[PDB]
């Protein structure tokens, strides 16, 4: 999910 917030 981290990839959607970078």
């Amino acid at each position, epitope marked *: *999910d*981290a*990839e*959607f*917030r*970078h």
Partner: antibody, heavy 119, light 113 residues
Framework: EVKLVESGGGLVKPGASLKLSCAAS????????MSWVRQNSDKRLEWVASIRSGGGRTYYSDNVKGRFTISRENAKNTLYLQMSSLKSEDTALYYCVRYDHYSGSSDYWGQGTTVTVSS | YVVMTQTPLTLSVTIGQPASISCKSSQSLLDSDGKTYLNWLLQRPGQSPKRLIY???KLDSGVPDRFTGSGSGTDFTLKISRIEAEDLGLYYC?????????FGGGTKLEIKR
């Protein structure tokens, strides 16, 4: 009713290619980032690939990088996973998964499509 | 790769009784934005995974409030105040703080009869 329906799974030879589809309904698909997550025989979940709602930016696990391509067709409300150079270790139930940017986590999963890599 | 560890691996519970599951991560799940992306999921036999808890303690709106989540840093707990028959299945923790996304190995809850 948010619904995700994967298809395309089946038996594929080692080294060969296969394309999975995930048809989305019940929400505005183009607004959401999407991912594929796979589940193996041991019931272990492993994230595979992600694609943003904007700019077409994509992300891959070290296990599938350079072999798989995730893409989307917003006109068809559909997510794809193009698999190539498949191997036995790719055998799994493949799930389409929506990331909900409003709540801060992936929320909805599909029913999954089964990929069997075998000669 | 952030390692997620669940205990116990299996749980046999009587309907009506409480239960809990522990999730520990190999490094802090506190994000630079100040939020903690720790999630819980249930997969019933033959069914799709369904979200239970997100952001440590926020309850999915389709899930009853007998489910609660707590914790911080590296240590997290899912609590079920009262077990019901449909709770049978595989429970997973997973983190959305660090790339890549990583999941606990799962906890199997079965109903004691």
């Amino acid at each position: 009713e948010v619904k995700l329906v994967e298809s395309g799974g089946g038996l594929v030879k080692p080294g060969a290619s296969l394309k999975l589809s995930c048809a989305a309904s019940g929400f505005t698909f183009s607004n959401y980032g999407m991912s594929w997550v796979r589940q193996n025989s041991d019931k272990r979940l492993e994230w595979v690939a992600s694609i943003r709602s904007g700019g077409g930016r994509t992300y891959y696990s070290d296990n599938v990088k350079g072999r798989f391509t995730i893409s989307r067709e917003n006109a068809k409300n559909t997510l794809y996973l193009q698999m190539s150079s498949l191997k036995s270790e790719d055998t799994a139930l493949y799930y389409c998964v929506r990331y909900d940017h409003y709540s801060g986590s992936s929320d909805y999963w599909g029913q999954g499509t089964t990929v069997t890599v075998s000669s | 790769y952030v390692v997620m560890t669940q205990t116990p691996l299996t749980l046999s519970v009587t309907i009506g009784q409480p239960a809990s599951i522990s999730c520990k991560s190999s490094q802090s799940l506190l994000d630079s934005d100040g939020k903690t992306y720790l999630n819980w999921l249930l997969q019933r036999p033959g069914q799709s995974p369904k979200r239970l808890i997100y952001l440590v303690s926020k309850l999915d709106s389709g899930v009853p409030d007998r489910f609660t989540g707590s914790g911080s840093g590296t240590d997290f707990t899912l609590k079920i105040s009262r077990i019901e028959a449909e709770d049978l299945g595989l429970y997973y923790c997973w983190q959305g703080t660090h790339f890549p996304r990583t999941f606990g190995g799962g906890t199997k809850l079965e109903i004691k009869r």
